[PDB]
Subunit: 114 residues, 4 copies
């Protein structure tokens, strides 16, 4: 199934934050309505916050996360969870190798903000 | 129901990161085995990271997040979500006022690391 | 925070299913637009499906689950999770006593159907 | 990433319930320790419960859900979510066709029971 694609409320600000846990340098690209809106990168095996940014989901609300290492796309896992019918998290894990810890880049999208 | 309390696997490193979305200064306390292990404080209405740290869950695995604003305890919401049977998120929102956006401090715990 | 309240897309069929795990007879009421639309009762300590049914979310999309044991309301927990940006689960646990297993009545709402 | 595989606490009873939403007949196999422990089958486009059972997770706790339709395995999506640190749901959706609604067999595992 497709992973890393979320329909957010239209025209709404959201946070997107990436954490690294791998010997490989991660590159995280965040697309809004199919165009790159943020790129984060770094290399840590201790959960460094390699990027965090506030973006607007735009008129369609479509947000997609893709992760690569060495130009090679990582395998993604994702889900969205909503607490008390209002607080939202869109969650992504990714695997760049063979150990299947899926934490090599971790991306959290949260809304609403403010 | 109690919120903000999670049982992690014992003796396991985990990340904890907090964001703020309120006019009030947030104070986030993280307890491991009922003892304070990290404290973050800051103010933002734009989802700024007010702290990030790596902690060890110790022999009990018990981790608790508590949020207060000028000593006033915030009401919490929380859940844990596991992707591909590997990647864990323990998520907390909190409310310091009346609007019930529950984003006034948002805390993300993630494991495994590395 | 409020629990057991979910906003579904309007005029959409959804499934609601209740399980019991308690010595007390559970009463589960499912409200759509603040009016009872399904009701299930029963006693099990083995996860009996005390009822399942297909409902329509109607014009408001507002769905609320209430649980009681001989008229005494149980304490609720809930969340919603979305898989591959399309498959929705609204989840409820409830506690009728002191042990805080929160499984005394468990309710799962799922959509879309068909 | 692998989907439909969950590690439960060892030697713990859990409920498993399957719903169908497709023209095709669904066969759902539930494996414990890599051997089939239960099989459900049925056809519905109205979310009928095609099976429900209580099983033991056994010594290893490894539980896997597989879904077959028309002679081929369906594509799965899954996650686990824990409420109030007590109540566990392991959730599976599956796609047997081309519309990507992922509801063709929906499987809910819940624990603890009793
Ligand atoms: C730490 C770690 O990181 C990572 O892993 C890795 C892999 C994948 O990426 O890879 C490997 N390799 C590399 C090479 C070059 O040649 N080879 N092999 C590595 N190793 C070394 C020794 O280097 C590793 O590290 C991830 O995935 C994991 O999870 C961890 O984090
Ligand atoms: C922005 C916002 O923030 C917050 O809210 C707030 C409240 C609660 O906290 O409070 C109020 N107030 C304060 C005071 C002092 O005295 N009074 N009242 C505020 N307002 C003002 C004008 O200041 C507000 O702001 C939260 O909760 C929300 O959500 C938002 O974020
Ligand atoms: C099995 C169980 O169930 C339940 O718990 C119960 C409680 C709450 O509900 O309660 C009690 N009690 C009752 C009475 C009348 O008289 N008293 N006390 C019971 N016990 C007996 C002996 O009966 C119990 O059982 C729930 O919550 C739990 O979780 C379990 O399931
Ligand atoms: C009636 C249809 O049957 C199969 O084609 C399913 O894959 C569709 O999702 C739909 O349920
Ligand atoms: Ca890895
Ligand atoms: Ca890793
Ligand atoms: Ca607020
Ligand atoms: Ca706020
Ligand atoms: Ca109970
Ligand atoms: Ca019980
Ligand atoms: Ca389908
Ligand atoms: Ca279908």
């Amino acid at each position: 199934a497709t992973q890393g694609v979320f329909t957010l409320p239209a025209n709404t600000r959201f946070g997107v934050t990436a954490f690294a846990n791998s010997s490989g340098t991660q590159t995280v690209n965040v697309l809004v309505n199919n165009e790159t809106a943020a790129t984060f990168s770094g290399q840590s095996t201790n959960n460094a916050v390699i990027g965090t940014q506030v973006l607007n989901s735009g008129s369609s609300g479509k947000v997609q996360v893709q992760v690569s290492v060495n130009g090679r796309p990582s395998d993604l896992v994702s889900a969205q969870v909503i607490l008390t019918n209002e607080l939202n998290f869109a969650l992504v894990g990714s695997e760049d190798g063979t150990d299947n810890d899926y934490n090599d880049a971790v991306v959290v999208i949260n809304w609403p903000l403010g």
